[PDB]
Amino acid sequence: MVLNGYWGYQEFLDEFPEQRNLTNALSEAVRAQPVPLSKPTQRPIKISVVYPGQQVSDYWVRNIASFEKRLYKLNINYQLNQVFTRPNASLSLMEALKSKSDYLIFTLDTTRHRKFVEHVLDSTNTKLILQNITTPVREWDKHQPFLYVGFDHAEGSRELATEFGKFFPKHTYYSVLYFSEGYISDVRGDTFIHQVNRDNNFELQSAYYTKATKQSGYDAAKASLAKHPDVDFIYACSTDVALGAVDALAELGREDIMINGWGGGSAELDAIQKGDLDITVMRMNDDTGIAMAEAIKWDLEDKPVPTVYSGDFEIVTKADSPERIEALKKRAFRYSD
Amino acid sequence: MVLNGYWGYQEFLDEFPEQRNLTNALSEAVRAQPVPLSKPTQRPIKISVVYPGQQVSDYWVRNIASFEKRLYKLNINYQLNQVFTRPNADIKQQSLSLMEALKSKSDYLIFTLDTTRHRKFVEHVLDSTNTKLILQNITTPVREWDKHQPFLYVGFDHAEGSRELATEFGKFFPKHTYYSVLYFSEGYISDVRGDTFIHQVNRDNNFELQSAYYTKATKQSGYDAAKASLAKHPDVDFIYACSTDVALGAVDALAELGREDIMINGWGGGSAELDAIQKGDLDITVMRMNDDTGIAMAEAIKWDLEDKPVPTVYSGDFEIVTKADSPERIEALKKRAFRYSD
Ligand SMILES: C[C@]12OC[C@H](O)[C@H]1O[B-](O)(O)O2
Ligand SMILES: C[C@]12OC[C@H](O)[C@H]1O[B-](O)(O)O2
Ligand SMILES: [Ca+2]
Ligand SMILES: [Mg+2]
Ligand SMILES: [Mg+2]
C-alpha cells in the first residue's frame, strides 16, 4: 500500500494459509499458560540481541523482559548477549557475528540493516529474528528469516488515521514528524498521510524527519510550527518524537494542537492521563516478547515455526477511564509489569 | 555490625521503647484479621511503587500481590503506579526516571535502598518533599537521618537471615572448610548478606574464604560468576550465594560442571527456591514469611490514614529450610508465607 517489495501481514497470511495456521497456533500458544520445552538441549542456546539504547520508549526493554521471562517459564537454558546501541553516531558493533549465536534478534529500519541481514541470511547458520517488522520481504521468498515479529505499523497507523478522520473534517491542516529516515517512517508516516489525504481530504502542511530522540522531536516540532503555525494536529511517528513534541506545544502555548503517541508504553500512558498526549495506539506489548520464546521453543522441538507474528492494538484516548487504562496495562505488561 | 552508620533493628527498638511498642503493635495487627479503615478518605490515595523487575525471585511480585489484597481487605481506595526500572545503564537515566515520579505527587512512595545512587535520591525525597517514604527490603535505620526518618523501613532483616544460614553452615561443616562467596550487585545487600555470613563463618568457625565475586543481580550473572569462581578455585566445599537469582544460576553452573560435591544455598525461600530445594538442587535456604511485609505496609498506611503513630521499622520472620524437610513442613511454611499471595 505504501512500499513496494513486501507482503502485507494479512496478505501474507491469505497467500499462504499454512502460515495463517501457524501464526494462529502461535497466537494461542502466546495466550495460554506456558507449556515447557519437551526436548532438553545439550547445552544453553546462545541468543544475541542488538537493540536501540536509551530510548524513552520502553518497547525494547519490556520486550526483552517478557522474552526472558517466558523463556524461563518454558524451562529453556539460554545465554543472552545484549547490546545497547547508543542513540546513533557506527553500527559496526554488529560484531555479534563473532558471537556465533544460535538466535539473532535484530531490527530492520534502514538499508544499512538490509545489507547486513542479507549477509546473515546468505552466510551463517544463525536463525534471524526481525523485531518491529511484520511484512515479509519478497526477495527473500526462497530463504525467509526465522521470524518477523512486532506490532504492524500499517495497522496501528491505519487505526490512528481512522480516528483522526473520524474526529476532523475535510481540509483539516496537519504536519507530520517522521521517525529517522527508513522503513518505520515510510510505513507509519505515509500510511497515515495517504489515508488521511485521500479518504478524508486533509491537507498536509509539512513533514520533517527527526533523529528519533525526544530532543529531536521537540526541535522538529518547533521548526515545523515556526514555518507552519496554522495546523490542527501534528502526527508523530514515535514515542520519543511525540513526547518532545508535547514539550514544544507546551512551551509555545499551543493547546489548540492535537498530538498523538504511537505504541502506548508507560511514558505515553502517563502523558495521556496527564492530558498532554491526546490519542495513541497501544500495543499489547508483552505478546511479542512471549512470541519469540514460543517460536524458539517449537524450533527446539522440531515443530514448524510461523514466519510472521503481529500483536494486537488498542486505541487509547485521554477520555478513557483510569479503569480502562489499568485493564489495558494488566493485559499489556502482564510479564514486564 | 558489618557496616557503620546504621541502627541495628533490635538496637533501634532497644533505644526507643515506644518505637518497639509501635512495632509490636504492627506485628499484632499484621497477624490478626483485617480491621478495616476507620477515617475514610475524600480521594483514592496515590501510591508510587519503584521495584526492580525481571527476576526469578518472586519476592516483589508477591509483596505487591499481598499488599494490594490487604489494602482491599482494609477497604482503602488507591491508585498504584509501577515505575519501570531498567537495571540497564545509565545512572543518569535512572536518576531522572526516578525524579519523574516525584512530580506524580503521590501520597506514599515505595522504594528500595541498595546503592549509594539510591541514597542521594532518597535524601532528596526526604529533604525536599511531603511524600511519605516506605523503604522496602531494609530494616536498619540510617543514623544520618535521625532528624527526619522515612515513614517506614520494611522487609526481612538481611543480618538475621544471614546469621541463621551461617549458623547452619557452622553446625554442618568443620573448621578449615573452604568456601566461596557470590555477592549480589554492589551495595548494602551484598555488604550485609555477604559480610555477615563471612564474618561469622570465618571468625566463629574458622572457615577459609577462597574467593568472592560481585554479580549483576541476575541468574545468568550468577551462573557466569559460579563458573569463573570454580575455574579459579575448584577446591571449595560450598558456595554461599547472596540472592535467589544468583543462587539459582550457581545451581545450573554446578549442574553443568558436574560438581554435586559442592553445597549451595538460596536466600529468601520463594517458589523457585522451594521447588529447587524439593528437587534437591538447592541444599538449604532461609525462607521468609513473605506476605507479612506486604500486609505490614498495608497496615502502616492504614494507621497513618487514621492519624495514628506508625513505627519507623518492621522486620518479618524467618525459617530455615533444608532438602531434608518433609513436604508437609514445606506445605505448612507455604501456607503461612503465601497466605495472601497464594
Ligand atoms: C518500537 C518503536 O519503533 C521505533 C522505536 O524503536 C520504538 O518507538 B516506538 O515506541 O514508537 O515504537
Ligand atoms: C528481595 C530480595 O533481596 C534482593 C533481591 O532484590 C531479592 O531477591 B531475594 O529473593 O534474594 O530477596
Ligand atoms: Ca566486605
Ligand atoms: Mg513518502
Ligand atoms: Mg495540548
UniProtKB/Swiss-Prot annotation, chain B:
One of its GO terms (cellular component) is periplasmic space. GO terms for molecular function: DNA-binding transcription factor activity; transcription cis-regulatory region binding. Keywords: Periplasm, Signal. CDD domains: PBP1_LuxPQ_Quorum_Sensing. Pfam families: Peripla_BP_4. It is found in: Periplasm. InterPro entries: Peripla_BP_I, SBP_2_dom. Belongs to the bacterial solute-binding protein 2 family. Binds to the signaling molecule autoinducer 2 (AI-2), a furanosyl borate diester, (3a-methyl-5,6-dihydrofuro-[2,3d][1,3,2]dioxaborole-2,2,6,6a-tetraol). This complex then interacts with the LuxQ sensor protein. This is Autoinducer 2-binding periplasmic protein LuxP. The gene is luxP.
